[PDB]
Amino acid sequence: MLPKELLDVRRAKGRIFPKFADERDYELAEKVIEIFKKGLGKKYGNLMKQARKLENAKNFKKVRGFIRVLENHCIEKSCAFDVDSELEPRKVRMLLFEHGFVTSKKERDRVLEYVARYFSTTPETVERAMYADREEELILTKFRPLTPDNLIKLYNLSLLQTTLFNALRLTFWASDRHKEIFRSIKRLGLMYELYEDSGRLMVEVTGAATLLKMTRKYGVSFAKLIPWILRAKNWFIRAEISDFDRLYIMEIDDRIRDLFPDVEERLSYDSTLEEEFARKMQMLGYEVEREPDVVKAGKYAFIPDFAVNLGDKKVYIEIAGFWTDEYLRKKAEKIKSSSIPLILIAREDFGDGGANVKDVILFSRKIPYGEVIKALKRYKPEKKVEGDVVELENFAEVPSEYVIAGKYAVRREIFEEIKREIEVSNPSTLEDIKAILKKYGLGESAIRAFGYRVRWIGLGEAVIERT
Amino acid sequence: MIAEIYYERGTIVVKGDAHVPHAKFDSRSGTYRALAFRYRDIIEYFESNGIEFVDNAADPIPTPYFDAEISLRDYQEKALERWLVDKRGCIVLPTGSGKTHVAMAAINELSTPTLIVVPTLALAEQWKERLGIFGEEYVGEFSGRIKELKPLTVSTYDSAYVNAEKLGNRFMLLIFDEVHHLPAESYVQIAQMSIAPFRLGLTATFEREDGRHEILKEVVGGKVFELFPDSLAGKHLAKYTIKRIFVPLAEDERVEYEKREKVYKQFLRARGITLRRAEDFNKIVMASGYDERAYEALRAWEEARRIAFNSKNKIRKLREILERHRKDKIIIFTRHNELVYRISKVFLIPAITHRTSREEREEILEGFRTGRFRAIVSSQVLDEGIDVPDANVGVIMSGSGSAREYIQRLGRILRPSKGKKEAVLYELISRGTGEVNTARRRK
Ligand SMILES: [Cl-]
Ligand SMILES: [Cl-]
């Protein structure tokens, strides 16, 4: 949220620690809030200007970071503005832009006088109205008060999460709130790998943030995970950030919980990227029983998203969004090693196209609910070791269905030889095809495949006898 | 009582400082001297460690400001960028007009006295014909046939070698065509004896030829970009060229810039730091902290960069480009929102910033998709998320490689116009104010 240029960090030998703000900084934060409070009716750019005159050599990194964060909050959440014009700026500018583009003062005046005539006004009023709904030209009407502790805590949260936006990968641990933090990971859909290592009963989680493709898209959802993390009672976070020749490492702790705002579960204005788990659990509900609300893991830890109920065992499925070739190969070798079902379906139209997986891969498109359904229908429940069904197969147990047939199966080559022998020998009788076929593997109910149907052409029907 | 360097017979002799690098004391002379090609390292020493000095070594041939708009292919532009990092090093290219063009663009950009050096007098005539684009007034040849000292002089290794002394201190840019000829013990004296800070070698060979590629890095610099014909014959040639325009600062703008320029530059060399990229000054001033005048430095630098990007001249140059393309579709791109809105106000072009709503964003792009708006100015459209409608012409106000990849992305969406062969991606680069040199009336 806070720009990487205006980043106030201490540069250590091999570490990096964000110089957070605290109650030592109350007095300032109050001063920058007061001129927004006292400057209602003032052009929002002029308040921005005043707030930045409070800038000097010692405070500039944070008095600027304050103005930025308050600005965002005021704009996005806690303020209401008036446009200082009688004209709607979108209307003015679209009529202007619809009259071509101008490359001279003369034709520029022509279109202005043309638009001014339309809006029953002067050209200067049209030139003012054009971008009058720009933040800095807006008139501040309602600023709701912020307590300077609030602003400081926000500054620390954005300053924390903008450092993390620039990092390559980060690993943390949380005491409480595993499930909803997990659910936040999945809807955000960043590539993960959870490990029960360097600890006991402690799930350690890792995730990358500095990618080659779509680096900002998931760079901006990566920092959207951190308030859920900071929402537990205890957490130990370390990250690996680098843009130099070498890397720096930071580590923040739950003892800094007093520096960041309290944020209960927001959970608003979305389907939570669970399009399939919410609508196509119903498409799969017609075929088998399913449970989108799943929590599972094996010897190592993998986050499922859906579950397929088979009687012998269940099939886990994961529907994460983000992916990369090098980043998928690690998560993929684990699913086969532990022999866990772990059905995986990615977005082949959103990420970059590299080399699809040899054994287990799923592609996606505009409507890919089938492209992965082709590989997924092959749940393959314990299909690696299969015995011979030629004989045995509970023969002692029950021969109730053991009346089908008697002996071995024919070979395609031999089958092709008998077919070739049958196409040319010219049979027309049952007693004529029976002898040609009895020479090699006799059997009556064995003209199943030769295209012949035996037919009693006489008067009446075919009799039977007891054996 | 002041340090001074002067030029003599292919060497620089320095008087007034003894820590000057690569200098060696000639007991016969009583003064320190080094090979003339140590010019940079010596000039760098005096300005990094703040020793004021006189320069009686350099006597450049007066050279204008070249604003030829040399059209480059994408990978040729890529080649130019990688060279300009050091402005000293070597390139290999598949074709030979590609080599020249890159050399042609670099000469255009640097606008200093330039000496091309080729093996044969046939090539010498081909270079100097190609260099006609900058005006034959400024092209010349210095070989056996004729000896004339123009801003763009072409010569052969053979005649340059015989004349390494008289040619040492008179050009700022040094171009070697088929550069692998240079490592002969005679031809290296050409390089070793000219003060020319900027050095470009053009070739197509490999890095395993008798181990003499070792002496190149010392005297011209090592490879910065490689592309052999086989990597060209496997990919389709993109349908657009990337021309570079050089826009001077106006006089008053150059007045104020040099002010703020002096304060930040004086503070940085007072520190004596070597900044890799100017963006690291946004961050070096924060992490180091513990400094009162570093704010005043940042404030001047920030003030300086702002004077440079809002150049009144760059919008006038954009005005000229727009008249030139009244019939085509155009996407202008900078990274500065104030400039995006300024371009929009001046030329009545739809703007798309990150503060633009998804409604008006999609309106603009659909109206650019149809014929409703012939142009867009924007700082977002080159993002990986949204797909831009096709266009015939791109402009990059920024010109710089802060975000180099944008030049690639802006090319991706360009397509030739009905009636023309290929598209164009201008890029506007802020260079000088005037007053480069004299009229070459000496001798
Ligand atoms: Cl000597
Ligand atoms: Cl002189």
mmCIF file of C-alpha atoms in Angstrom, chain A residues 26-275:
data_model
loop_
_atom_site.group_PDB
_atom_site.id
_atom_site.type_symbol
_atom_site.label_atom_id
_atom_site.label_comp_id
_atom_site.label_asym_id
_atom_site.label_seq_id
_atom_site.Cartn_x
_atom_site.Cartn_y
_atom_site.Cartn_z
ATOM 1 C CA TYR A 26 1.817 10.316 18.620
ATOM 2 C CA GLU A 27 2.489 14.055 18.741
ATOM 3 C CA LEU A 28 3.267 14.230 15.011
ATOM 4 C CA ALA A 29 0.419 11.947 13.888
ATOM 5 C CA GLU A 30 -1.967 14.208 15.786
ATOM 6 C CA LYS A 31 -0.605 17.261 13.959
ATOM 7 C CA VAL A 32 -1.225 15.817 10.485
ATOM 8 C CA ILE A 33 -4.753 14.680 11.406
ATOM 9 C CA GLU A 34 -5.726 18.110 12.731
ATOM 10 C CA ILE A 35 -5.375 20.041 9.464
ATOM 11 C CA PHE A 36 -7.583 17.531 7.655
ATOM 12 C CA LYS A 37 -10.100 17.945 10.483
ATOM 13 C CA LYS A 38 -9.754 21.735 10.503
ATOM 14 C CA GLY A 39 -9.667 22.046 6.714
ATOM 15 C CA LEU A 40 -13.149 20.984 5.680
ATOM 16 C CA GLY A 41 -14.323 23.008 2.712
ATOM 17 C CA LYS A 42 -10.686 23.193 1.543
ATOM 18 C CA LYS A 43 -9.375 21.766 -1.725
ATOM 19 C CA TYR A 44 -7.984 18.335 -0.856
ATOM 20 C CA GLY A 45 -4.714 19.117 -2.630
ATOM 21 C CA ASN A 46 -4.170 22.153 -0.410
ATOM 22 C CA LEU A 47 -4.514 19.999 2.711
ATOM 23 C CA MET A 48 -2.036 17.511 1.215
ATOM 24 C CA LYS A 49 0.203 20.547 0.733
ATOM 25 C CA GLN A 50 -0.089 21.804 4.326
ATOM 26 C CA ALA A 51 0.474 18.334 5.776
ATOM 27 C CA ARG A 52 3.745 18.122 3.869
ATOM 28 C CA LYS A 53 5.067 21.465 5.139
ATOM 29 C CA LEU A 54 5.293 19.674 8.545
ATOM 30 C CA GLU A 55 8.128 17.760 6.911
ATOM 31 C CA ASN A 56 11.740 18.239 7.994
ATOM 32 C CA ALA A 57 15.027 16.337 7.941
ATOM 33 C CA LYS A 58 14.247 14.021 10.866
ATOM 34 C CA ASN A 59 10.563 13.255 10.230
ATOM 35 C CA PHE A 60 10.272 13.184 6.436
ATOM 36 C CA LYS A 61 10.215 9.389 6.031
ATOM 37 C CA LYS A 62 7.262 9.101 8.430
ATOM 38 C CA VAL A 63 5.457 12.421 8.028
ATOM 39 C CA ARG A 64 5.254 11.480 4.347
ATOM 40 C CA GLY A 65 4.270 7.899 5.120
ATOM 41 C CA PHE A 66 1.553 9.276 7.392
ATOM 42 C CA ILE A 67 0.117 11.605 4.744
ATOM 43 C CA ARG A 68 0.077 8.715 2.268
ATOM 44 C CA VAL A 69 -1.767 6.278 4.553
ATOM 45 C CA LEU A 70 -4.229 8.837 5.914
ATOM 46 C CA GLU A 71 -4.819 9.944 2.318
ATOM 47 C CA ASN A 72 -5.683 6.396 1.226
ATOM 48 C CA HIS A 73 -7.957 5.847 4.245
ATOM 49 C CA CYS A 74 -9.701 9.227 3.931
ATOM 50 C CA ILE A 75 -10.206 8.709 0.188
ATOM 51 C CA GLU A 76 -11.231 5.076 0.258
ATOM 52 C CA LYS A 77 -13.098 4.786 3.561
ATOM 53 C CA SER A 78 -13.635 7.756 5.858
ATOM 54 C CA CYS A 79 -14.305 10.872 3.766
ATOM 55 C CA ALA A 80 -16.872 12.450 1.437
ATOM 56 C CA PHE A 81 -16.059 15.026 -1.232
ATOM 57 C CA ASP A 82 -17.692 17.673 -3.428
ATOM 58 C CA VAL A 83 -16.628 18.479 -6.996
ATOM 59 C CA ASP A 84 -15.993 22.232 -7.311
ATOM 60 C CA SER A 85 -17.809 22.538 -10.623
ATOM 61 C CA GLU A 86 -21.313 22.966 -12.003
ATOM 62 C CA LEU A 87 -20.401 20.468 -14.756
ATOM 63 C CA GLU A 88 -19.974 16.694 -14.473
ATOM 64 C CA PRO A 89 -16.289 16.113 -15.325
ATOM 65 C CA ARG A 90 -16.837 12.736 -17.012
ATOM 66 C CA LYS A 91 -19.364 14.347 -19.377
ATOM 67 C CA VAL A 92 -17.065 17.286 -20.189
ATOM 68 C CA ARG A 93 -14.041 15.153 -20.880
ATOM 69 C CA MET A 94 -15.832 12.536 -23.030
ATOM 70 C CA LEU A 95 -17.361 15.224 -25.245
ATOM 71 C CA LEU A 96 -13.901 16.849 -25.450
ATOM 72 C CA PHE A 97 -12.129 13.536 -26.220
ATOM 73 C CA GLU A 98 -14.800 12.648 -28.768
ATOM 74 C CA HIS A 99 -13.754 15.730 -30.706
ATOM 75 C CA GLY A 100 -10.591 14.049 -31.884
ATOM 76 C CA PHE A 101 -7.312 15.167 -30.456
ATOM 77 C CA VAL A 102 -5.838 18.591 -31.059
ATOM 78 C CA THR A 103 -2.245 19.436 -32.013
ATOM 79 C CA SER A 104 -2.457 23.231 -31.948
ATOM 80 C CA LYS A 105 -3.751 26.036 -29.764
ATOM 81 C CA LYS A 106 -6.115 27.052 -32.571
ATOM 82 C CA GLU A 107 -8.028 23.798 -33.027
ATOM 83 C CA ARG A 108 -7.846 23.279 -29.243
ATOM 84 C CA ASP A 109 -9.714 26.582 -28.819
ATOM 85 C CA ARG A 110 -12.219 25.528 -31.499
ATOM 86 C CA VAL A 111 -13.235 22.385 -29.549
ATOM 87 C CA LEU A 112 -13.248 24.206 -26.201
ATOM 88 C CA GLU A 113 -15.471 26.970 -27.581
ATOM 89 C CA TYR A 114 -17.533 24.171 -29.124
ATOM 90 C CA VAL A 115 -17.950 22.335 -25.807
ATOM 91 C CA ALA A 116 -18.386 25.590 -23.885
ATOM 92 C CA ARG A 117 -21.234 26.526 -26.233
ATOM 93 C CA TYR A 118 -22.848 23.131 -25.584
ATOM 94 C CA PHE A 119 -22.686 23.518 -21.773
ATOM 95 C CA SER A 120 -23.905 27.147 -21.957
ATOM 96 C CA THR A 121 -20.657 28.286 -20.377
ATOM 97 C CA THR A 122 -17.208 29.726 -21.099
ATOM 98 C CA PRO A 123 -14.195 27.706 -22.263
ATOM 99 C CA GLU A 124 -12.328 28.428 -19.013
ATOM 100 C CA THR A 125 -15.132 26.740 -17.068
ATOM 101 C CA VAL A 126 -14.835 23.758 -19.411
ATOM 102 C CA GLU A 127 -11.071 23.611 -18.931
ATOM 103 C CA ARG A 128 -11.518 23.728 -15.147
ATOM 104 C CA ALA A 129 -14.329 21.155 -15.127
ATOM 105 C CA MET A 130 -12.419 18.609 -17.243
ATOM 106 C CA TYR A 131 -10.572 16.877 -14.385
ATOM 107 C CA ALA A 132 -12.312 18.522 -11.433
ATOM 108 C CA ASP A 133 -13.080 15.121 -9.858
ATOM 109 C CA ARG A 134 -9.359 14.480 -9.388
ATOM 110 C CA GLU A 135 -8.529 13.883 -5.719
ATOM 111 C CA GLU A 136 -6.409 17.022 -5.315
ATOM 112 C CA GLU A 137 -9.041 19.264 -6.944
ATOM 113 C CA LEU A 138 -11.861 17.869 -4.795
ATOM 114 C CA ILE A 139 -13.344 19.809 -1.873
ATOM 115 C CA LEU A 140 -13.074 18.035 1.486
ATOM 116 C CA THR A 141 -16.553 17.921 3.049
ATOM 117 C CA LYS A 142 -16.551 15.206 5.746
ATOM 118 C CA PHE A 143 -13.396 13.955 7.461
ATOM 119 C CA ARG A 144 -14.178 11.659 10.264
ATOM 120 C CA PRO A 145 -11.762 11.912 13.194
ATOM 121 C CA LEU A 146 -8.977 9.371 13.505
ATOM 122 C CA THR A 147 -7.259 8.844 16.794
ATOM 123 C CA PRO A 148 -3.480 9.264 16.187
ATOM 124 C CA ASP A 149 -2.981 5.770 17.588
ATOM 125 C CA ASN A 150 -5.147 4.507 14.709
ATOM 126 C CA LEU A 151 -3.083 6.255 12.024
ATOM 127 C CA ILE A 152 0.212 5.046 13.524
ATOM 128 C CA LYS A 153 -1.036 1.450 13.665
ATOM 129 C CA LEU A 154 -2.167 1.637 10.030
ATOM 130 C CA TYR A 155 1.177 3.110 8.945
ATOM 131 C CA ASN A 156 2.927 0.171 10.613
ATOM 132 C CA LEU A 157 0.622 -2.333 8.907
ATOM 133 C CA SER A 158 1.102 -0.914 5.420
ATOM 134 C CA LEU A 159 4.818 -0.327 6.043
ATOM 135 C CA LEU A 160 5.075 -3.959 7.151
ATOM 136 C CA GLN A 161 3.151 -5.332 4.168
ATOM 137 C CA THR A 162 4.999 -3.243 1.574
ATOM 138 C CA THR A 163 8.320 -4.643 2.721
ATOM 139 C CA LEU A 164 6.747 -8.093 2.334
ATOM 140 C CA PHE A 165 5.495 -7.209 -1.156
ATOM 141 C CA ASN A 166 9.142 -6.836 -2.231
ATOM 142 C CA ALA A 167 10.261 -10.148 -0.705
ATOM 143 C CA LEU A 168 11.046 -13.391 -2.515
ATOM 144 C CA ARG A 169 9.515 -15.786 0.038
ATOM 145 C CA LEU A 170 8.373 -15.750 3.664
ATOM 146 C CA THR A 171 7.729 -18.356 6.369
ATOM 147 C CA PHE A 172 5.748 -17.974 9.582
ATOM 148 C CA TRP A 173 3.935 -19.819 12.376
ATOM 149 C CA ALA A 174 0.625 -19.083 14.114
ATOM 150 C CA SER A 175 -0.719 -20.371 17.429
ATOM 151 C CA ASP A 176 -4.480 -19.869 16.941
ATOM 152 C CA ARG A 177 -6.803 -19.323 13.972
ATOM 153 C CA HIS A 178 -5.278 -21.979 11.695
ATOM 154 C CA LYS A 179 -8.466 -22.756 9.778
ATOM 155 C CA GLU A 180 -9.560 -19.236 8.840
ATOM 156 C CA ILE A 181 -5.969 -18.220 8.096
ATOM 157 C CA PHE A 182 -5.785 -21.323 5.887
ATOM 158 C CA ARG A 183 -9.051 -20.355 4.184
ATOM 159 C CA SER A 184 -7.573 -16.892 3.604
ATOM 160 C CA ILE A 185 -4.516 -18.516 1.995
ATOM 161 C CA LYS A 186 -6.689 -20.524 -0.406
ATOM 162 C CA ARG A 187 -9.047 -17.756 -1.543
ATOM 163 C CA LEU A 188 -5.917 -15.664 -2.072
ATOM 164 C CA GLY A 189 -4.494 -18.785 -3.718
ATOM 165 C CA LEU A 190 -0.770 -18.187 -3.283
ATOM 166 C CA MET A 191 1.496 -21.190 -3.798
ATOM 167 C CA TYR A 192 2.196 -22.849 -0.452
ATOM 168 C CA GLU A 193 4.160 -25.610 1.252
ATOM 169 C CA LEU A 194 3.433 -26.444 4.908
ATOM 170 C CA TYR A 195 6.026 -28.261 7.023
ATOM 171 C CA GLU A 196 5.925 -29.827 10.490
ATOM 172 C CA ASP A 197 9.657 -29.228 10.911
ATOM 173 C CA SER A 198 11.854 -27.213 13.290
ATOM 174 C CA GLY A 199 9.017 -27.607 15.789
ATOM 175 C CA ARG A 200 6.564 -29.957 17.465
ATOM 176 C CA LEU A 201 2.840 -29.902 16.636
ATOM 177 C CA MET A 202 3.749 -26.653 14.850
ATOM 178 C CA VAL A 203 2.767 -26.251 11.202
ATOM 179 C CA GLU A 204 5.366 -24.007 9.547
ATOM 180 C CA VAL A 205 4.110 -22.438 6.310
ATOM 181 C CA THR A 206 6.014 -20.958 3.363
ATOM 182 C CA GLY A 207 5.035 -18.848 0.360
ATOM 183 C CA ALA A 208 6.789 -16.819 -2.346
ATOM 184 C CA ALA A 209 6.135 -13.226 -3.366
ATOM 185 C CA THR A 210 8.736 -12.100 -5.965
ATOM 186 C CA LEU A 211 7.738 -13.919 -9.146
ATOM 187 C CA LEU A 212 8.732 -13.426 -12.767
ATOM 188 C CA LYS A 213 5.190 -13.216 -14.169
ATOM 189 C CA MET A 214 2.170 -11.571 -12.514
ATOM 190 C CA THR A 215 4.520 -10.433 -9.755
ATOM 191 C CA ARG A 216 2.283 -7.557 -8.612
ATOM 192 C CA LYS A 217 -1.089 -9.312 -8.948
ATOM 193 C CA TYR A 218 -0.141 -11.917 -6.347
ATOM 194 C CA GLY A 219 2.348 -9.521 -4.784
ATOM 195 C CA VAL A 220 -0.719 -7.527 -3.701
ATOM 196 C CA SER A 221 -2.722 -10.549 -2.506
ATOM 197 C CA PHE A 222 0.321 -11.895 -0.652
ATOM 198 C CA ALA A 223 0.190 -8.914 1.737
ATOM 199 C CA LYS A 224 -3.564 -9.541 2.004
ATOM 200 C CA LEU A 225 -2.778 -12.680 4.035
ATOM 201 C CA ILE A 226 -0.839 -10.904 6.789
ATOM 202 C CA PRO A 227 -3.754 -9.478 8.872
ATOM 203 C CA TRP A 228 -5.185 -12.983 9.328
ATOM 204 C CA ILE A 229 -1.739 -14.059 10.542
ATOM 205 C CA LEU A 230 -1.471 -11.051 12.869
ATOM 206 C CA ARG A 231 -4.970 -12.023 14.115
ATOM 207 C CA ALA A 232 -3.713 -14.974 16.160
ATOM 208 C CA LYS A 233 -2.532 -14.654 19.749
ATOM 209 C CA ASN A 234 1.001 -15.810 18.900
ATOM 210 C CA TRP A 235 3.027 -15.762 15.701
ATOM 211 C CA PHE A 236 6.693 -15.926 14.672
ATOM 212 C CA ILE A 237 7.228 -14.526 11.156
ATOM 213 C CA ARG A 238 10.481 -14.397 9.191
ATOM 214 C CA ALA A 239 10.872 -13.313 5.576
ATOM 215 C CA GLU A 240 13.582 -13.225 2.910
ATOM 216 C CA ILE A 241 13.693 -9.921 1.002
ATOM 217 C CA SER A 242 16.277 -9.000 -1.629
ATOM 218 C CA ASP A 243 16.690 -6.582 -4.514
ATOM 219 C CA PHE A 244 20.474 -6.136 -4.132
ATOM 220 C CA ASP A 245 23.338 -8.467 -5.011
ATOM 221 C CA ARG A 246 22.739 -10.172 -1.656
ATOM 222 C CA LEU A 247 19.685 -10.881 0.483
ATOM 223 C CA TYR A 248 18.480 -9.430 3.764
ATOM 224 C CA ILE A 249 16.336 -11.310 6.272
ATOM 225 C CA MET A 250 13.834 -9.901 8.738
ATOM 226 C CA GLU A 251 11.933 -11.592 11.532
ATOM 227 C CA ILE A 252 9.007 -10.032 13.384
ATOM 228 C CA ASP A 253 7.277 -11.520 16.408
ATOM 229 C CA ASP A 254 3.871 -11.527 18.075
ATOM 230 C CA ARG A 255 5.254 -9.157 20.725
ATOM 231 C CA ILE A 256 4.710 -6.345 18.177
ATOM 232 C CA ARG A 257 0.952 -7.044 18.128
ATOM 233 C CA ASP A 258 0.399 -3.734 19.959
ATOM 234 C CA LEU A 259 1.617 -1.804 16.888
ATOM 235 C CA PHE A 260 -0.998 -3.004 14.403
ATOM 236 C CA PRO A 261 -4.753 -2.406 14.268
ATOM 237 C CA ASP A 262 -7.377 -4.865 15.441
ATOM 238 C CA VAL A 263 -9.123 -6.418 12.433
ATOM 239 C CA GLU A 264 -11.840 -8.996 12.965
ATOM 240 C CA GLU A 265 -12.735 -11.270 10.045
ATOM 241 C CA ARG A 266 -13.853 -8.944 7.239
ATOM 242 C CA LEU A 267 -15.262 -11.592 4.845
ATOM 243 C CA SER A 268 -17.332 -9.315 2.604
ATOM 244 C CA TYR A 269 -18.068 -8.674 -1.077
ATOM 245 C CA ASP A 270 -16.820 -11.870 -2.732
ATOM 246 C CA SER A 271 -17.432 -15.520 -3.531
ATOM 247 C CA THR A 272 -13.961 -16.250 -2.051
ATOM 248 C CA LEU A 273 -12.569 -17.759 -5.301
ATOM 249 C CA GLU A 274 -14.520 -20.946 -4.461
ATOM 250 C CA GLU A 275 -16.486 -20.878 -7.703
#
